[PDB]
Design a protein around this ligand. Structure first.
Ligand SMILES: *C(=O)[C@H](CS)NC(=O)CC[C@H](N)C(=O)O
Ligand SMILES: [Ca+2]
Ligand SMILES: [Cl-]
Length: 200
């Protein structure tokens, strides 16, 4: 990992969870944590984690293999090649009748991101998924999607539950770096990246 990130797979990373007071969502999300089934499915993995964490009925559970079994929003063949945009992520979640608030970085700011997300992370029954450019947080890749689990107030870092579990552990990222990474233009959408709030 680049030195600006603190891996959850370290004593320091564990301590950031232990000293966080905005960490409720870590529990149900970790309980549903999955590895993206292929290199393009980060958004699908993120969605099914959140849907299962919310208790959404599809035992009747969501799976990356059953998610598209919704197709009218975006075809699985398109997602397999290109992933999904922030707006497509919103619509895919909404296709199962769940409430979504999509926040493009261009329409908000770092202070409101931090405040609203930190408050959300204290609450069960709702969740946050981020869409960000990996290069901007010191990681390898283009645009990625994963849920957020916790916020450490002392260090101003958010815990990303990275669904690329074969490649990276969950990481604690500085708010400033995560903001910079969301405040990037996705060439597919020609819109900024950002974050989504998900609730019943
Ligand atoms: C994760 O597996 C995929 C890899 S392409 N990423 C996304 O679905 C986000 C894609 C979107 N266009 C972006 O660039 O942020
Ligand atoms: Ca929450
Ligand atoms: Cl799965």
């Amino acid at each position: 990992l680049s030195p600006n990130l603190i891996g959850f797979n370290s004593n320091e990373g564990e301590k950031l969870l232990l000293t966080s007071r905005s960490r409720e969502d870590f529990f149900p999300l970790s309980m549903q944590f999955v590895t993206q089934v292929n290199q393009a499915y980060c958004g699908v993995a993120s969605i099914i984690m959140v849907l299962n964490s919310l208790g959404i009925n599809a035992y009747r559970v969501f799976t990356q293999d059953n998610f598209f079994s919704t197709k009218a929003v975006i075809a699985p063949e398109v997602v397999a090649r290109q992933g999904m945009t922030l707006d497509e992520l919103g619509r895919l979640i909404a296709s199962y009748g769940v409430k979504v608030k999509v926040n493009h970085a261009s329409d908000t700011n770092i202070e409101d991101f931090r405040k609203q997300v930190a408050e959300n992370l204290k609450q069960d029954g709702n969740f946050v998924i981020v869409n960000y450019l990996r290069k901007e947080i010191g990681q390898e890749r283009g645009g990625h999607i994963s849920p957020l689990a916790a916020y450490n107030e002392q260090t101003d870092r958010f815990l990303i539950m990275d669904v690329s579990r074969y490649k990276y552990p969950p990481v604690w990222v500085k708010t400033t770096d995560l903001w910079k990474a969301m405040n990037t233009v996705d060439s597919v959408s020609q819109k900024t990246r950002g974050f989504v709030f998900v609730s019943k």
